[model samples]
Target: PIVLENGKLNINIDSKTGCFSVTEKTSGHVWKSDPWENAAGLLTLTDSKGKKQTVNISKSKKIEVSKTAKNTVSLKFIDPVFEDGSVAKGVSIATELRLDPNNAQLDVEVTEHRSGNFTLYDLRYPARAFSLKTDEDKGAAVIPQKQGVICPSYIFPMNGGRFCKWDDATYNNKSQGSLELFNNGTGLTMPWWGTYNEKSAVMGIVDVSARPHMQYNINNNGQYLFNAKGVMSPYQRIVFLDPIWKLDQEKGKMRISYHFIPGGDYVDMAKVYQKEAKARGHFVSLQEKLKRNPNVNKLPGAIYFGIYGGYPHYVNMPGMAFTFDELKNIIKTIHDDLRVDKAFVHAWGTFSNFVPHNYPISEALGGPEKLKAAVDLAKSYGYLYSSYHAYSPMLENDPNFTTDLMQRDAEGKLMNTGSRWARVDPKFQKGLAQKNIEKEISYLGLEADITNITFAAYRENGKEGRIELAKYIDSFNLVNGTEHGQEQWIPYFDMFEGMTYLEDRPLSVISHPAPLFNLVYHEAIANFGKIQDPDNEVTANGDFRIKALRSMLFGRGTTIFFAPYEFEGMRPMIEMARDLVSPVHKETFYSELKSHEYLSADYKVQRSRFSSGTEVIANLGPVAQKIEGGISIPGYGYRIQMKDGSLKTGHFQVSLHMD
Candidate 1:
């Protein structure tokens, strides 16, 4: 065993098993290392037959230990041996482990070297790492999947879901994808997960360099034995990251840091993440972004809306796709009729080709002149205007899509990319991006005040391609917007759409939403709820009013958008959002989220405190209750201590909480 110690932490490593333990000095609590598939393998590799097997990177290798000038100990497992008690020829993994003198942190870096027909399709480093054992043992896991959630372990009577292997074709079908806790809709909004026990806490943050080329495989370790009902087991969740080898030419070389906390919670984990995010140049505050593009000043409290420009729809439906001229009238309504002071407008799918080639002005939807008039009208009212756009992953039939611009898998097969479309090589995007961006403005005959960039998951040189693409977009000096809300891109994007709810939220019976992203970045980005409308049947089971409230509690803005297809159906929400959600947004746009809590154990009642001094208490259940000071929160209502300390109350009825 190799023992290493710091003022704040201690480590024990088994050179043979590749298992290690971490001890936080203040708490004297040891977090045990979790082994993969009952074996102490620190890394995993995919063989030539497409099967993933664990390889112990330490079992039979010469260990290097040294002291650096900074008063820290360093250990290197250079080209470690395989876990199977044998030396695997032609594969090398050099992992460095280090601990500093004063910080409760463990820093790790792994670099891969491959050759000699070794057939290393993919591999995951630092596998079987630290784990929070069934913290029915008094601990919780902080998963920053999307909005983020705090899992007080064993929350589920059963484990996460059925296991799916990389090579198994029949696994996902056995369950029809119903039972898994698979994340958003393979990628994490932020690339990190943390665990906390009664005495100690630790957060694992992946290096920004590898985030884009990775999909997380996070879940609990064991279950209550399926048929073993009331006799429950503790919830012990573990974290693992899968590096998509085809997208990553670096062969999964990356770094991950695990920071320890002396008995803290998700709040503390978020603090460390934010601190690291800023240091890595990812956390750009709204203040900095505003200084760069003053137009962002209008984003906070602005009514964010999108009009689907995909015309030629079903005649029997509510209506047809919106034309540029038709939307002009609505922009006028938003400004003059509804009395909205600020608005953000997006024109989407304006051409039949989805992401139209050459960025042509859609003649089918009233031509260039008509579109210019609409843009001019929105600009005339000082409203921010941009179109929903993406760089690659266009339909194979799209005018500019060619074989030379395709994204390929490990075997060099064209990536189908699902839904009848394919991806363009992100490597090709840098050159073409300049052209498409320039064409978009010229074709529209107007300069967009805001630039909404979506589907930027191209992984050239890992995250470099995505970062460069955003850099190019930022060069235009337009306020930015993005869909998935990437950590590296947060500084560049002014607003992140869809912060309100999770798509799989209705499926989970155990985990509840926590504001991991909002905790770190409430003031850094203008987070807005998904496009909501009274007529949206997806929300038919949900109370539209509470949807607005949820956004406010998360310190996010509200959205109400639809095409002319449901302009009539979507009308009621426009006024509702304006009245119910917009004012709170206007109040807290510049504020940081100070704290959030579950006022009721069942989590039906909650509260949020903002830096602007606004406090909001929400009641999501079916009963009206008096909070205090003679203030009663209605069944589906909320009571607010507005920034000025004045009390404001709003109420609603509930269904399934879908909206």
Candidate 2:
């Protein structure tokens, strides 16, 4: 077995075949899934005997192992050492390894699955190396680029939507520079919202109003020079969704290829695979593409996935009615064919884009019964699921679900109004703003019943015509009852067999009382700022939104969706987020630190350690959340899964909060 003389791992490369092999380290442990105890689910890769192993490397550097099986590790370039310049760099990546000398009989089998193919002859050099990291016995991250698992997520649905209102100059100015405004346009502002094209193909332009109303011309000098922001940022956002899969065997390595067609095919394929995996009682998931653009074919270091749908409202399709059976079939099809493991189904929204919504009764989705259903389904598939809810008259003290939360106007009338999305009235809006919060109090019921449900609540305040207009629409034209004053609310929709997710959470924090105030609000305001509305106007009165946004962020809540383009456009916000989230990183590091022992037991052995004092473990569990990573995890990490829905790793995160 070769060893690292300096920081680099010296290896004897096979001249004939471009394969390499690293010697085995002490292996006596097994692997575990996140949320703990959901073993036997998909993606759970535990050694028969717990093995001990560790590796730590920052993205800034490269780490490699020897061509032999000695477990020797290496680090290359990019500040090969830590801040102390002692040995390794920042401890983000780790592994769970265990030695199993007693189980020598199984060593060949395990080696075949973990490190055999790389040693084969007459092959092309793999673009990436295989590695592992873990934070807990119940957690681990696995990404195999050569084995063909790549997750491609686009900026469109997540945070690249257009917001109408702002001028073209603002968009162009911010397109490359900062101080970029999302709300702007001539007649109306249209910001890209939701996640329909986030996974597959993106449309160039998405007109929020479908009607251009640009007036005057704005140049870089903030003066009028053109008709409109020279064709508001293209409405179409495309994600290639190229999926690849690779596996190593004693004999050779194999890689499979897949791509998206932009339409409903990928979604359809996802449904089909989901069903098949479930039918076979096997773990299934198509996670880990969000870290890179879906259009780009690059293997992610870890998987980027969410239990709750990110911005459920982004599912696209609007004004279409569907039955529970149809949705179920679609889900089954996705599972059976395309391979989607986790899903976040929403309860509200007439469009029924992400989650299935039956009219009127949708009151329940935002309520307890629906929440229970979502959680139940997730449990059945050994996956994670969440529902949506916000304060509105529609969910106020109804006979089916009793409550008394809401504000009162001068007349002291129950503020029983909803939003245009729900169809409430102005009177109700006025009352809700008048300090009646009984209806808001009722959301607690749902929070209690569905642990997996991320309850997102909205505080109806009078700004941007939110509370007032939301009330008017909620009261007068909820669902199909009435169209309010405008044409029957024609919600642009894209059919999705999966679930809904959102960065919006004021509605949820109020209900759960969890320390997620900062989560949702911070996410909301950040997302609000990222809105690319072409019609944004100085008179839009969205100013009050900042207060609400701040309330949520300071409250410490959790949100799912990354604001459109914020990951790319809002660099400062990203940096600030990184700064504010240091506590989370510390917690994640500690979480993994604590998991070493338990994880050792799960795989039934102990793992070896890398030069940096971290462990490398494989991802083996049933559900998508089985592997954890994200803001939840301290390290710059991710998760990877196969096109057929099997997880690779990089999916779980657990951070510590100094406060």
Candidate 3:
């Protein structure tokens, strides 16, 4: 055993077994590594045509270990045997652990070597450290699925997608449920995850450069599933599965740092990662972005109004088919009569036809003259007039449609972003954007202040073209917003479209959505929406209420897609955004998020304090909740406490009014 110690933390490494443990000196909490779970990976035995023979989990044998420094330990493992008792030379893995003793952090770097026919397809480093059982266990894994979810031990049906039913004949399936975080996929919005017991917590922060090659999984499992009518299961274990680095796409070492917080919670964990992100330039404040474009300050109290031009293509989408001249009239009312301070008039699908060379401005929706006039009107009202210029989805009917612009999978197949939309190659992003902006939008007299570009990927040179496009837009004194946000796009794009994540998952699967993104990047970007109904199911009332309130609590603006027809139906909601959400956001937008806490254990009543010393406490529950100063907040209500401890009441919604 090789032991390394400091005043705050210590690490114990078993040289022969490759088992390791970390102990926090302050709290005496230890994360002892799992023995049976030490380094499991798949080895591919295949021929040249990629036709596989025997693909099995190669049993890794610890070959060497050494102490490099007083704060560092190194170990290597090689696979010599398959689970089937077959002798085939497999790949090798080398890992090093370096400790930051004073700060109580540990960094691990893992690299693989492949020589023979054995190719490791997928890899997750170290081992399963610790798990919590549902037998009255309070431990939970703080997951970064979308916004973030605190997952405790819960019921998990094995080996099935969506709905699963285990039967008498079923056996030995260790798989349960997993949270996959691929960059652009339905994975993590960020590149981090944390595990916390009631007494302590630890955060795993991966190097941002390795994000494209990484995907993460937090697997929930059951030891035994009984053959019964209703699926009786054993104690569930919440495993913070390490970030799975796909070797098929990557060819280098992977590094991750773990920050140990003795007697700390999820909020503490996020702060630690925040420091790393800021240091590495992953975080640049909104104040800094404002210097790039002072007009972004209008975003603090504005609503993102997505106005549709005309799209018979997907005929049934709501708020569809509004003419440019008609949109001018609505904006006039919103600005003049309704007293809306500002708006991000995101004109969607308003192409001459959404086809390539989206110019000439749809004749049916009033031609170039009317469109340019409307754009002038919106800007005259001091609103951010943005137009849709998505380059990722190259339509088949487009004049420039070609497989050359589309991204292809490893199998040499054109990967359709959908049956209708082809994934634009990352290399073509800037060029296509240039054609759209320079040749069409700019040259055609469609004046606008912002552009929505929903094109991004995790392939080679992903950020190269995106960086070019972002700077290009900045040159025109224009802003950009993406479909969903990524940390890589920070300080580049001014805002994001859909960051309130995983709208498809149920309330039961992930009920507690923490402001992990805002905790770090609230001051970095102007964030927005999540589709109220992602599953094409009927929109639930309570769910929308939670979403709206949740955004306000997280210090974000609103993006609602309501046409002139449903303005009356959504009038109260619009008022809520203006009266409630906008004011709080305006006051807090420039400051860093200091901390967030759940006042009630059920995880409904919440409070977030900003660096400006302002506190916004929200009661998302159906019942009322009380606060520290014997103040009662009504159901579906909120209260803002300023730096001087003065409470301000909002008229649009809330329980009690305070002076």
Candidate 4:
């Protein structure tokens, strides 16, 4: 047995079983039981044939320990010897453990070396890492998934088993129980997770270089389990990856650390992540963005129009495609008739392809000269004209689409999925982006809005491709846009194209909507497009009034778009968006968030307060409720109580100040 202490934290470990317990010395609060069930330094591995193997260091008879420093302890243990005609014969793992000099945080490092024909499938450490007991129903887990989400772990009864995996269907189903890393839609913005109750909190931070993989689950007994799984393959195990001898004889190491807060809440936990994120240059404040694009600081709402998949049947045009002049005319009509201030155009590139191609405007759209003319017209009308560009994808048939310029796996083979689009290597994007931007300025006469740069990640040299691509975009004084409200991309993108206001269904039995993203980034960037209205037309369940209310309540902007077919059908939405623009378009945004009653419960009416002294409320239930201080919102309706003594009710603003 060994004991490690740091002022208020006491950790006792059983060297034989590799099990451990954590205690708060000051309060006599025991965080975990002795001889942890799964052991601290346990490892699970799977072979190529799907055979499973488990190794527990405490079970090893040859365990060795050394005191590296007054605050640090190191443990060395060997993998259980396996000689059963398998490649596991030559596998080895070594683990080192240390305590922070001045805090209750534990730092662990694990190294795995292999020297056989067997391939490494997965690696995990610090198994059953946390065990907590709450005095009341205040235990919660704050996961940094899709901005951030709170799990009221102790509030719910675990009568039945539940599990959520890292997959698209799970996310699409609005499953709140699972979180995945490195996902395209909704994933971890920062590699961290925290658990806390009324009296204490614990946070885990993963090394950025480790390429972390994580999943969270709670058993029916309300026991919380958070995992940090390090992947050793080219693709995530569940995702598609050609099985090969990639890690047959290779070695790799990873480190994960935990911090203990004797008395803290989720808000305090967020600060730790924010501090680290800012230090890594991952955030760009709204003030910083305004200095670069002064024109965006006070810009009015904009409209989006695209000419993809041809025109609508309502149009008298003979064919689906439009000339540059015709596209400009359509945008002009929408802007003039709808009172919109700007136009975001799409499908104006070569062969009208959504994915970009070689530089230069397509002759089919009247070439560069005509495109430039249309852009000047939009600018003449005091509108910001932007088009589409993608830095991550390239046409597979293009002359410059060399396999060498594409992404590769650990086995040194190019990622040729035989799809229409190939992921562009960051090295190649440097030149391609320069040429694309040069033509965008020379031919289009302005910087174009780029998309798909953040939707898919393409890495180069252990760095995210988006970071390199953002560097290229920043080098030129260009205003860029992206597909989603990914927090890390805030500094580089002037606008985010899609952000959802609320889930179609409640997140879970205890889920309620909050302005979490807006609280973090409303001032720093502009995000458009509703998840419910991806295209020009609204779905059958679309309610512009409710969307407008959600937007105003969150201090978020709304999208006004029309397909060639939905031109007339989308008119009312345009007018409604116009009515909402002035009320929610405050000069400043607030970072603080406060919700009443329904933040963590299943109540019908919920209200969120912003630091700007504005209060927005939504009534999701079938009946209206008279909230305190004033206002009665109907079912599926929302209202804003502004600091300026103004009340905005369903696209109508009324002054509340007495004369």
Candidate 5:
């Protein structure tokens, strides 16, 4: 037996059986693993025709164990063989474990080797890993998908198309429930997972640069299981080899680092990851943003109003559409009568093709001179104005749309998703954007507000393009925003125009819709509004009360889609929103999540406290909930409990308020 100690964490590895145990002294929590019968690693492979085969390496020979330092140990598992006694063909794994002197985390790095015909499809380095048993054993697992969620033990369910689920009846099935990240699919912005019982907790943080997928299971006869993979399945039976992974064979070994946190709940787990992300300069705080652009602090008093110039094929159809001059008139009306202070314009010119050629503003929509006029008008009224432009759908007939510049599949064929636009190389499109920006500056005498871009990817080259674009936007001190709110964009984007709320799932399955994103980033960037599309009629058809409730609960900036004349009709709802959002909009989100509670089993009535000492209760049910503080929030409404014990009711109003 060999023992190694680093601060409060102690590890004991049995040399004879090749099994290990971990003890976190601070929490008096222990994690142990069952002795390996044959192997310590699992690998999945795919053939040329998209068929899959999984293999387990349980036996190791010529093992070399060495103590590198006081707090470090290394193990070389050599000549791995399958359970059937045949060699693994061309695969091997080595691991190094060390603990940080100042932190409670134990760092683990696993290196894998593949050669000849053996191509890696999936990997789990610390195989057969399990945790100590708990009383009555009801554990919770945190999966960071769509903000975040906590999955109850033994309640595994399939998630999206990219992840996996175990087939209950098939003992032969080796599938696992995994959270696949970096595919631009439904996975969360960050990749990590944690599991904990009543007393002990364990969190895993994968090396973000490696882009790994995480898996968890309590299938070990009700014991906790945790593992992560460097290679992930994009869809069942299909393996994708990204550019970096594709170079693994010729460029030598594949190395990935995994981190383990010994204590704390999911919030603490998230902070562990957030700290590293912040160190890498992935975010800029909200106070810093306001300091750079003093006008941005006024965002809380603003409402996002968008104007689109009909379809691309139709132009100059009189009052049926809005011109740039008309947009200025709407801004005047919203500010003077409705108390709104911001606008996001979506005007496509005569052709309405999203990509620009010579001019930034389309010639059909009163061109550059008219656009400047409207921008000046908004500035005069202390309002913010920006327009939308996309980086994709490079039209087939576009002069710059060359076939070589498009993104291709493994077979070297161009990929077009049925829209008139086809995905292009990130660098190629970025050059096009630079050209447009230069023209906008020369013509309008200032930078234009570029709001949305459709493509954000995980491939190294694609990510570089996003970083380059962001840095370029910042050069002019512009306020950037993305419709795609990848976590890294927080540093560059001033706001995320829309983040859709998912209502398709059963509420019981929902761990709870806490503001996980805001908890980490509310002080960094503005994540304003929900998608205000008419197609999503549930949120679009004048459900002002519920919308207002969402803004208060999430501390979000309001966004509404309305025509120029709709201002008079939207006055009351607009005023109520401005009053409620102004005070807390700039305040840091200080949540007493420990004191948070669901007032009912239906998951409708919930209350949360913010940093400003203001408590808000949201009732999205059919019945009113009466609490102790002389506060009764009606169904489909909200009420704010101020720090001074005063109650302000929140309900939808449509008439004009003269006061």
Candidate 6:
């Protein structure tokens, strides 16, 4: 048992079980419990009531506890092992522990003497998990987006896939098809997603030399320590942990411990699973569900693209085999089951190169004609779809993808992209993107105004910042850069010239959570690209901001975008959008979404359902606003609030937005 002594109370923790117990007899009603799926393990503290607080161990290997009194009570504890030493004994029951500490690992176990009530919040789920079978392929390019998706459907990033063993047939069916997760090697594995396999771990490209990234040695005594440096074979696992659990309430305190089984895939819990036919109709309902969720406001969700049959892969070329009937069924499913607010799909040019999905010249699968048909079909379903326009230069073979499309670098020598994507002649590639957009909208029935348009910025400033601001920088320092510590547009433009906004086109800016949060540190590369003429004005679609707000209120679309500028408490923008939808429904929506979870010690959200009427959620407050509709969410971080209006208690996952 590891014990940390402080003035107010005595703390005890089990090295194995990660169970934490806080003994608070002198201070007011002291209590404790883990909130975020035991991310910080056990939590113990003193509450407003004058009674000692003892937490029950659940299934966590970490624990945190604190005491917030002034003339604090001295540490008191006798028992060494109140519960199993395995780090899977505590669960989240509250967000803030009593007498917050710098590091709040609990070290005491008091008997269950119920005093103050506890609450738990909703558990968070990862949208995509980037899998890696062997470390060698970890650097493989990620899968493309759903070519032409828009608005509400645009809220998620290209979810990463996890590594799995070869021959894992389960991998094919079990995967939500996260291109990120790949089959690296062969193994007698199960569940394709991740199973029994032995491979060495890597600390990504940057962490190779770090001590923490080193491998561990498990001795006979069950002790684990760093084992070696580089390994013979590559083994990798990426686990997403919420950052909210790292909050420091007291000084000299140890943060909660982690019991992650590195390289091992965790069980998946899908709230809106893919296999579930429930999402077949009224697809927009997913938005309605979150709309009423007390913890989430209409902040931007994430960026996602819509594609049919083989998405991303055929992103460049239309899938001729994907006929109107298939599209109709898809639309029906979305509107009928998902009831998605805004959605988008791929366009003509992108579908042109969809490998096996693309049919011969005579076939109707890809090419200009077929793409038009797909767009028209999407319109009928009432979704916001857009295509991925990389121009020739931005493609897989093209070097000057954007340079060719945009035309003219400071010294226009046929804009060279150094052979990257779609390798086309620099001259032709330069003019390809916008020309394609104009050609499709004009020749094809695809409409922009009625349809939400997405544009991807390919040029980068050669730097990286913290994708999740909350993780790297403190909130105080973050507010200094921009409102709410946002760093999107500024860095994008600074990195690439003529990259700020496009001219004479209706386009919504595309930004992943990393750039959106200013994860990069280069000052020159921190803001959006520069528009040569300040007054030249390339991207002038102010309406996108409004439409974005609409998506947040209605469907919670995921688009990777940056804030034009920071503002204070921007909830009104979304609130205004909600007003535009329907006030009557709004009120009812809040009322229906309310749950006891937020009010109890379990501040967790439950899967709910409603038909025909809107659910009204009122208990949501400032924390809800801070989530920013999950748009600003980093790939990691969980903030689930129960209907009872408590965020501290619940099984919370980090950012569900894929990377």
Scored by lDDT, the top model is 3
lDDT scores in order: 0.61, 0.22, 0.63, 0.53, 0.54, 0.25
Total clashing residue pairs per candidate? 2, 252, 3, 3, 7, 194
> Per-residue lDDT of 1-659 in model 4, one digit per residue for the tens?
68888887887776675556677665565665322344554445564465765555455445666666776666666544332433344455566678876877887676544434454544445654554332243566565544445555443422233222212222233332334444434455456776666677777777655544554432122111212243222211111000011133223337666777777655566556566667767567656766776655434345444444232111123354566777677667766887766555554343333344444565766777777777777777665666556655655445454555577889987674554343566556656667566666666666555555444332234245557767777666556666664665676777676654234322343333344455455656666654336423445323554555555555556665543544567666666665554445442242344333343133446676766677777765445666666657676666767778787665233238988
Q: Could you tell me how far off, in angstroms, the CA of residue 422 lies in candidate 4 after the best superposition?
A: 3.9
Model 4 Cα shift for residue 421 (angstroms) = 3.5
* Regions of model 3 farther than 4 Å from truth: 35-62, 133-137, 153-182, 212-221, 224-238, 310-319, 397-400, 407-412, 417-422, 436-450, 453-458, 506-508, 531-544, 627-630, 642-659
Q: Summarize candidate 5's per-residue lDDT along 31-145 as a digit string, tens digits.
A: 6654323234455554333344445534555455677887677766655554345554445556676667766666665654543355555666555443423223345556565
Per-residue lDDT of 164-281 in model 2, one digit per residue for the tens? 2122323243211111111111111111111112222211111111221111111122212123545333222111111111121112222211111223212233333233323433
Q: Which lDDT tens digits does candidate 6 get at residues 274-352?
A: 1121222211222343333322221122122233233223332333335534444554554455444434333222443
**Where's the lowest-lDDT run of ten residues in candidate 4?**
236-245
Specify the poorest-scoring 10-residue window by lDDT in model 3. Answer: 162-171
Strongest candidate by TM-score: 3
Q: Can you write out model 3's per-residue Cα lDDT over 1-659, one digit (the tens) per residue? A: 88888888878887765567888778887776753345333334443344443222325554677888899887766654554455445556677889986788888877655646655555555555544434334656776655676655443332243223222212223233344444444567666777777767888888765642232223334343244335755433444445566566655457788888877777887788788878878687778777866777777778877765434243223456677777778788778877788788876656654433444456867776777787788778878776666655667656556677776778988776574543665566667666657654564343334444343333344556667766676666555566666776776677777666654452233336788878878888777774333211124324445656676678777777754565556566667677767767777878888888887755667898998788888877667767778888777777888767778653224348788
Model 3 TM-score is 0.84
Which pairs, if any, clash in model 4? 17-58, 18-58, 286-524
- At residue 234, candidate 1 shows an lDDT of 52
User: What C-alpha lDDT does candidate 1 achieve relative to the native structure?
Assistant: 0.61
For model 5 the local lDDT of residue 275 reads 72
lDDT tens string, model 1, 1-659? 67778688777766555456887879898877654443233444554444555455555355555545343344444444443444445555445667766788887766544433344443344544555444245556566656776655433222224112311212122111111121334235666776776787888777765642343333434332222465443533443333332212453436777888897778888888888777887777888887877777877777777776442122112345667788789888888878788788877645434442435556766777887888888888888888666655556544555666666778988775663332555555556567566766665544343333333232333356666767787777777687645555677678877654555442133345778889888878777766533213356324566666677788877666566666667666777777767778888888888888766545667888889888888886667766557767787788888877788887864448676
Please give the RMSD of candidate 4 to the true structure: 8.0
